[PDB]
């Protein structure tokens, strides 16, 4: 019967909780209370980027940290030259309902996906002058989320069918399938090393999956609601999670438990698009009160507020070199933030 | 000032050319009407789609009526969280809701009672606080042969009216309209469909014209 199996699972969960609590001698706040604070931050936008006519859900600049891919609900993928405020390519999407963009480390492929249950890969550096759909991938029974780019031949995505997939670019067939989530899966940030990845489901669970082995290794439950944002802390030993409630949580990888959380009583709205700087000192998250928030990712205290937007911020990212921060909201406006 | 680096001169212009295309699509999207189709169970969704199409994601419809390109999106093929992707359909011209009259007898709580909460969630949704809603009462002919045999008291214990279509249908329409908690800013266009005198497309066109008048008034000052 299943009663003894359920009891054994409960006992295993209790043992896991006891082991997690055993290695809780001190918290991160106590350690970081003796370090210099980040101080006041007054980053301002120096860009216009006025070419969209719908809500934007697009980030993942690329390796060059100069070209930025952008998508909206009008079914157009635009490549922005951030340095000169220019448009490179305009790809008309077959499905106008899309929330996913990737630029690939090579920089010659652009991936998109949404409620069409279709992952579209478009080739950029082609002999012709247009942008052709390099491949169409199907097999998901839910809205697509994230099109991360393990290699030029492998792409990992998530869907609302509580599964994650890893497909091959050359062959349009399923290669690796992950089925361990009980809710919709998004937030698939692809590590600093690309050897691993994590998925944030809608049942307050963040699960790390082995790319080669194809099995789950660690499960993190510290939220009280759905998680819709993730990062990987380019050091590679922790990751940040954002939920629809106004709180963010930093889960350590080796410790396999939460270190600390960023929250405030003055904010009640949601959180999207969690990203990290190249050093991990700052955490930037697009909140749902028409502005972004920058937190100190070591102690607790806030660092700054980026209010240069009119609608809810949906996408937000930082370049590989950490030069500037891109932010896209629902007002069809993309902003680039820099220090002074 | 800096000669614009020659090649970049040909670059920005290309970007401008893209702009020339982009707005050309955007304006094309301005004069296009987008409608959202929803339903709890079968609700005669396939029948309505087939009827209006002659004139695993989203089954879009490209049908046109009197120089007005209507867009119909079906979201019943997705089995996932509703509110995760319900904000993408905000700002549509109108939303079409289909329910079945003959669903008060079948169960799996009856189907119509299950549709009531869906209708309440859609009408009271924050993203749809200013969009007119069109409701279709399908399976009208089945009600005629079902009400005589199956009394309406099973679904409505607080009903004591005459067991006639002209009264039961009116009561059902009123009950569906009572769920509109924001009637001061939204309106419900309720209509019955049948396999004859196909005025359903004409009714949808009239509702679209009404909501277009509403939107134009919002844009042009008054109301």
């Amino acid at each position: 019967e299943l009663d003894q199996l359920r009891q054994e699972a409960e006992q295993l969960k209790n043992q896991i909780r006891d082991a997690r609590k055993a290695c809780a001698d001190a918290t991160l706040s106590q350690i970081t209370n003796n370090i210099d604070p980040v101080g006041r931050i007054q980053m301002r936008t120096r860009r216009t980027l006025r070419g969209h006519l719908a809500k934007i859900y697009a980030m993942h600049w690329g390796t060059d940290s100069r070209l930025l891919v952008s998508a909206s609900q009008d079914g157009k993928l635009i490549i922005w030259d951030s340095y000169t405020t220019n448009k490179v390519h305009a790809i008309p999407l077959r499905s106008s309902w899309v929330m996913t963009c990737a630029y690939a480390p090579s920089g010659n492929y652009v991936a998109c996906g949404g409620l069409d249950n279709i992952c579209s890969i478009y080739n950029l550096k082609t002999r012709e002058g247009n942008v052709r759909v390099s491949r169409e991938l199907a097999g998901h029974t839910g809205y697509l989320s994230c099109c991360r780019f393990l290699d030029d031949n492998q792409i990992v995505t998530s869907s609302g069918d509580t599964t994650c997939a890893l497909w091959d670019i050359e062959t349009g067939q399923q290669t690796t399938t992950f089925t361990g989530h009980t809710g919709d899966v998004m937030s698939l940030s692809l590590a600093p090393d690309t050897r691993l990845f994590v998925s944030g489901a809608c049942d307050a669970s963040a699960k790390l999956w082995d790319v080669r082995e194809g099995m789950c290794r660690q499960t993190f439950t510290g939220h009280e609601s759905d998680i819709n944002a993730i990062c990987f802390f380019p050091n590679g030993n922790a990751f940040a999670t954002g939920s629809d409630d106004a709180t963010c949580r930093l889960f350590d990888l080796r410790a396999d438990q939460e270190l600390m959380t960023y929250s405030h009583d003055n904010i009640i709205c949601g959180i999207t698009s969690v990203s990290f700087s190249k050093s991990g000192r700052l955490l930037l998250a697009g909140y749902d009160d028409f502005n972004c928030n920058v937190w100190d990712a070591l102690k607790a205290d806030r660092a700054g507020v980026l209010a240069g937007h009119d609608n809810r911020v949906s996408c937000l990212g930082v370049t590989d070199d950490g030069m500037a921060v891109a932010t896209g909201s629902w007002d069809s406006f993309l902003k680039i933030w820099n220090g002074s | 000032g800096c000669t614009l680096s020659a090649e970049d001169k040909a670059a920005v212009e290309r970007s401008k050319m893209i702009d020339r295309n982009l707005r050309e699509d955007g304006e094309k999207a301005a004069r296009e009407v987008k409608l959202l189709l929803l339903g709890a169970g079968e609700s005669g969704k396939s029948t309505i789609v087939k009827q209006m199409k002659i004139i695993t994601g989203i089954v879009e419809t490209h049908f046109t009526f009197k120089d007005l390109h209507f867009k119909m999106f079906d979201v019943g093929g997705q089995r996932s969280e509703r509110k995760k992707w319900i904000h993408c359909f905000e700002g549509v011209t109108a939303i079409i809701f289909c329910v079945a009259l003959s669903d008060y007898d079948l169960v799996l709580m009856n189907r119509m009672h299950e549709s009531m909460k869906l209708f309440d969630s859609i009408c009271n949704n924050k993203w749809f606080t200013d969009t007119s809603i069109i409701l279709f009462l399908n399976k009208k002919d089945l009600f005629e042969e079902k009400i005589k045999k199956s009394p309406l008291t099973i679904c409505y214990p607080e009903y004591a009216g005459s067991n006639t279509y002209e009264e039961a249908a009116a009561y059902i329409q009123c009950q569906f309209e009572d769920l509109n908690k924001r009637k001061d800013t939204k309106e419900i266009y309720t209509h019955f469909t049948c396999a004859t005198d196909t005025k359903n497309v004409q009714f949808v066109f009239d509702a679209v014209t009404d909501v277009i008048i509403k939107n134009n008034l919002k844009d042009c000052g008054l109301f």
Partner: single-chain antibody
Framework: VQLVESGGGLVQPGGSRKLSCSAS????????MHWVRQAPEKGLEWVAY????????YYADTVKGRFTISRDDPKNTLFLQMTSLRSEDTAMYYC??????????????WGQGTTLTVSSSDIVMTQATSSVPVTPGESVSISCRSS???????????LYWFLQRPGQSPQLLIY???NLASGVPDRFSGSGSGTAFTLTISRLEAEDVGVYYC?????????FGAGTKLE
């Protein structure tokens, strides 16, 4: 991708004639087009250029105000008409394609050429060596010089290298003196500094001899180089 041109022949001086360049295999409507004239024994020369969408059109100094150009995207063709021909216009005309975006490769593919015969402050580029023997397996260097500093105030140079095989149209080798062209062998390389550029060929094999041309792109009146020939 294919570019084929027609309209050649022998014409008396003072006449008018049009050349038609038709492209099959790529998007004509989004590509700028250039015309390059080659003398029977001298080097390549620029004629005119028309941008995508017929936005900006430029002509050479010797042909300004006399030649005319046009395109038809639905027909995917480029027409260039000349009036009042002279003896100095006797050259083979190449219709070439280019695109201008971040990390683009202008002048990537050239045309085939048409034989036209007549019965009767610009930045200059000079190559010190015009001919030098080569051997199958040794490394060689080709030097190009410019009268102006091609290093624009953005971080990149506008040098191009073109190879003309003995019987084939010129083909791009490297662009911007630092990026390799598509489909070209990795043996070729380029480097240098302001007003002094070099191109290095290492592990050279057979079936690669021809004429080498260096291009500046700082300002529209593009001027070819003298030409380096290896045999």
């Amino acid at each position: 991708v294919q570019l084929v041109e027609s309209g050649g022949g022998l014409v008396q001086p003072g006449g008018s004639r049009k050349l038609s360049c038709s492209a099959s295999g790529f998007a004509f409507s989004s590509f700028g087009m250039h015309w390059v004239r080659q003398a029977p024994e001298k080097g390549l020369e620029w004629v005119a250029y028309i941008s995508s969408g017929s936005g900006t059109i430029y002509y050479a100094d010797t042909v300004k105000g006399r030649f005319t150009i046009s395109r038809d995207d639905p027909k995917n063709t480029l027409f260039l008409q000349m009036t009042s021909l002279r003896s100095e216009d006797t050259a083979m005309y190449y219709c070439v394609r280019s695109i201008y975006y971040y990390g683009s490769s202008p002048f990537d593919f050239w045309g085939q050429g048409t034989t036209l015969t007549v019965s009767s402050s610009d930045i200059v580029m000079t190559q010190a060596t015009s001919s030098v023997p080569v051997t199958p397996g040794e490394s060689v260097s080709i030097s190009c010089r410019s009268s102006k500093s091609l290093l624009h105030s953005n971080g990149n140079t506008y040098l191009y290298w073109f190879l003309q095989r003995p019987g084939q149209s010129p083909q791009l080798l490297i662009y911007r003196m630092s990026n390799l062209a598509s489909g070209v062998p990795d043996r070729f390389s380029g480097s240098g500094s302001g007003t002094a550029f070099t191109l290095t060929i290492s592990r050279l094999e057979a079936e690669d001899v021809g004429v080498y041309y260096c291009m500046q792109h700082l300002e529209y009146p593009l001027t070819f180089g003298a030409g380096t020939k290896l045999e």
